[PDB]
């Protein structure tokens, strides 16, 4: 019964390993999810520069 329990645990670990390999392959195929296989491109600096350029329109004067 100890070998039966260890075989059941190792078999379930094998199925979860195969399923996470499939999930990681489908995630790297499409680059969909935000955890792995995702390059975070941010426009924070573009919005900061646009806000600064909008702020310096008020500063234009004499």
């Amino acid at each position: 019964e100890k070998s039966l329990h260890y075989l059941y645990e190792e078999n379930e670990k094998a199925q979860i390993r195969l399923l996470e390999d499939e999930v990681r392959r489908k995630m790297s195929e499409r680059n969909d999810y935000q955890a792995y296989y995702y390059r975070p491109s941010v426009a924070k600096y573009h919005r900061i520069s646009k806000e600064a350029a909008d702020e310096l329109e008020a500063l234009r004067g004499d």
């Binding site: 392959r25 790297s28 792995y36 975070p40 924070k44 919005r47 806000e51």
Partner: protein, 164 residues
């Protein structure tokens, strides 16, 4: 004509495209080795022995390429079978031609064994359907918590896009 591959047609279908493909791979390898040859070891002076060393290092590779392709086509068309031992015969022939450039009989066979091994492994790749250098199906661009790793001092302005 010059953009023809080796495996766009089956074995024994066309000769000239296979000759051009294998010979252009041999020319690329010979030029890539000869550029590192004549500047580093046994550096020649003058226009004539530099081109002589380029021919001496490129043309024998062309001869190995066309000899392997010609005896591969001969072994394929001599019978009805298309199997790996035709590539073994072609690798033995290319090793034997390389030996002649060496001028050593031992060098030619010793080379033919390894070239036949490379030929039967490449024909195994063709038959089974896998690639030597495939594209990676998984490419980890980063680890976990890749959104929470933004340690920046600048405050984010509100975005112009929503998910609604």
């Amino acid at each position: 004509l010059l953009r023809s591959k080796y495996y766009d047609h089956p074995d024994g279908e066309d000769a000239f495209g296979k000759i051009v493909a294998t010979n252009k791979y041999a020319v690329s390898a010979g030029v890539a080795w000869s550029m590192f040859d004549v500047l580093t070891l046994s550096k020649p002076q003058g226009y004539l022995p530099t081109l002589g060393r380029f021919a001496y290092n490129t043309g024998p590779l062309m001869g190995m390429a066309t000899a392997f392709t010609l005896t591969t086509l001969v072994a394929t068309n001599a019978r009805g079978k298309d199997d790996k031992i035709n590539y073994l015969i072609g690798g033995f022939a290319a090793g034997g031609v390389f030996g002649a450039w060496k001028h050593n009989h031992v060098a030619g066979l010793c080379a033919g064994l390894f070239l036949g091994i490379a030929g039967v492994i490449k024909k195994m790749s063709i038959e089974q359907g896998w690639e030597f250098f495939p594209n990676t199906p998984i490419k980890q661009y980063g680890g976990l918590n890749i959104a929470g790793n933004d340690w920046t001092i600048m405050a984010d302005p509100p975005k112009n896009w929503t998910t609604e």
